[PDB]
Amino acid sequence: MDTFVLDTSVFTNPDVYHQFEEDQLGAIENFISLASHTNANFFMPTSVYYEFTKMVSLGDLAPKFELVVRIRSPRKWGLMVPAEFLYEFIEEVRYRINKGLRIAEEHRLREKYREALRAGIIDSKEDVDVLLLSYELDAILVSGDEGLRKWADRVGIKLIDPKNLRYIMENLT
Amino acid sequence: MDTFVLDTSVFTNPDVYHQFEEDQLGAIENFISLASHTNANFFMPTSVYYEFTKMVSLGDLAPKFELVVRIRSPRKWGLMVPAEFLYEFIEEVRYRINKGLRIAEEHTKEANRLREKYREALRAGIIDSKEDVDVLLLSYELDAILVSGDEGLRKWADRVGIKLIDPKNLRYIMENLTK
Amino acid sequence: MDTFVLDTSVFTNPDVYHQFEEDQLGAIENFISLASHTNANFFMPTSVYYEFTKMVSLGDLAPKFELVVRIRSPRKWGLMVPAEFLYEFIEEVRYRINKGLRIAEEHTKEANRLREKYREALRAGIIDSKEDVDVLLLSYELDAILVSGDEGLRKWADRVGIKLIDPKNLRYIMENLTK
Amino acid sequence: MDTFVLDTSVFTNPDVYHQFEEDQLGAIENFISLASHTNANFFMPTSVYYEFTKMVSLGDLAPKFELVVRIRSPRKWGLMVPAEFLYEFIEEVRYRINKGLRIAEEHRLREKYREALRAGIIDSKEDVDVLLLSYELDAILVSGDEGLRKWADRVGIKLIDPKNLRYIMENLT
């Protein structure tokens, strides 16, 4: 059985969700439908699912989604990880925090600095939840975020072109 | 054979180093003297020792300190550590960035400059979080007792299951461990 | 269950891909077709697949190719590899830098520019060496048969003990392995 | 027994070899002398020893040095190393090669480019020989090169302030 960890970008980036349907809620509905007939496991971190529910009005599709996708918190599960990954992660957060500062520079600036760095911290956390969950399960990471795909590849994690999730699932009935 | 990992706070916080002497470099020398004849192993992470050097002028004490205290990197390869250290790191970089921005506000008013001050406050914020991770990681790896005059770090150690002592008790324990 | 790691050369070198078809995208499609019904596992390192994409327009073949061929990163964590790969890497970056500087000379004469050309020739020189290390490393890790139309890489594989085949024989072996 | 891997800088950087003696050949002679009475092992990679003999006229001190220091080629010994170190090394070579290019830029430029990059390759090789030998033996790396010390620290290798080699050896009779 193939296991897949899904990012929010899967259902919020039209270049990805158009393979299911051009309509966003219909794309998700089609994903849910196909998943229930696919010989595969699907996981999404809890932080990422919280973001997904905050940005898309799922309505009745939420409890349907909760029948096909395992929503898990890799932090609350207490994983062990090689010390080299812990320092790779810190470099990734450092770099993300510096991006947040260059962003605040392009925009007193107190108000702009606090919000740019808070977003960069939250981005870092959700990314690590996605990479830890993939690592723990030895799963295929599916993401429309090229930056997270490069990060997953630096640490050996398996990927697909997220534009081929539907094609892959259909060849896994 | 009791093993200890030392924080900078032990030789920086006067509440902690007064147990050795009121004099700060006298406190360090007394600690060094006790560490010479002991059944105790003493460790400090490399990054923490660097900070120690920057905020204290050891002079001719540095070679003796580097001999009695084993300065090591916790970036070991075959070692597995709890993923909770990534989350501790995130939680601390958050609080230190918030503190850092409050401090760069004050300083820029007393003195462009605010861009350089905010940049400094966060580079320091990261350095301090990574230094705390080095301390907790080296304790975890060596199954050592963490000695820290910093309560924030102690609460974190307790969270991840690291053995602690009241740092005010270090000299009495070192006196026991003398050969 | 025979496992193979493919180089870009197999679908780029016409001496190798002619065994499938004279047509280059027909050769790739025939390979894909054979790989669909086999007791063979096919792998390609992620960095090598990227290069493949840049020098060939697969179009609607890409999703099928990414399904039959497993695109993986050889940056695995618990894995031990021979230190000889560091030395192979050094030896190749040497020769590729030397080649690169000869090529940037020629091109700048036909066309500042030479600073940009030398910079490009070495960034490509590094990329190509790291791509060769990804190929050999993924073979070593999976204990796979390396398939490469590049003789330089074959001599290197033989050095480190990696199993090889004559890449001109890939279609006949794939025909055997069909279910 | 403490094991030590020595860099060339130990005997070519006056800030380091002055602890033995202000005279360079006398500093080496004093090191050799003390080493023979120290309860410790001393190693130097063969590439680094070749550099050391090429830059200092050792004379009769060479065969004396060969009685106290093990000269070993970590490449010819066939080590195994975690895959994460192999990619850390490639980044270090990339960065070293880029330095070599920025150096050639500060100085047709063909002649200057070939020599700057050749030196950067050789620096990279000798550094990795020093770090591999330290890793294999679980040794203390001794080096006056701050860049190599930072590299060794990124990969968990043990260090000393090379200005304290003599003091350390004297407390290890």
Numbering used by the authors:
A (entry chain A), D (entry chain A): 1 to 107, 125 to 190
B (entry chain B), C (entry chain B): 1 to 111, 124 to 191
What does the paper say about this structure?
In contrast to other RNase Ps, HARPs consist only of a metallonuclease domain and lack the canonical substrate recognition domain essential in other classes of proteinaceous RNase P. We determined the cryo-EM structure of Aquifex aeolicus HARP (Aq880) and two crystal structures of Hydrogenobacter thermophilus HARP (Hth1307) to reveal that both enzymes form large ring-like assemblies: a dodecamer in Aq880 and a tetradecamer in Hth1307. These data all show that a monomer of HARP is a VapC-like endonuclease that consists of a PIN domain-like metallonuclease domain and two protruding α helices, which are thought to be responsible for substrate recognition.
We sought to better understand the structure and function of Hth1307 using protein crystallography. From the lower molecular weight fraction of Hth1307 discussed above, we first determined the crystal structure of Hth1307 to 2.5 Å as a dimer within the asymmetric unit. The homotetrameric Hth1307 assembly is generated through symmetry by two identical dimers resulting in a dimer of dimers. In the tetramer, two dimers come together in a side-by-side arrangement, where the two dimers are angled at 41°. The tetramer interface is considerably smaller than the dimer interface, with a surface area of 589.5 Å2 between monomers, for a total of 1179.0 Å2 across the entire interface. The 5′ end of the acceptor stem is positioned in the metal active site, and the T and D loops are recognized by the pentatricopeptide repeat domain in PRORP and MRPP3 (32) and the CR-II/CR-III modules in human and bacterial RNP RNase P. This arrangement allows RNase Ps to recognize tRNA structural elements and select substrates through a molecular ruler mechanism. Upon inspection of the electrostatic surface of the tetramer, there is a positively charged region of the SH domain (Fig. S7, (38)) that includes residues R125, R127, K129, and R131, which have been confirmed to be necessary for pre-tRNA processing activity.
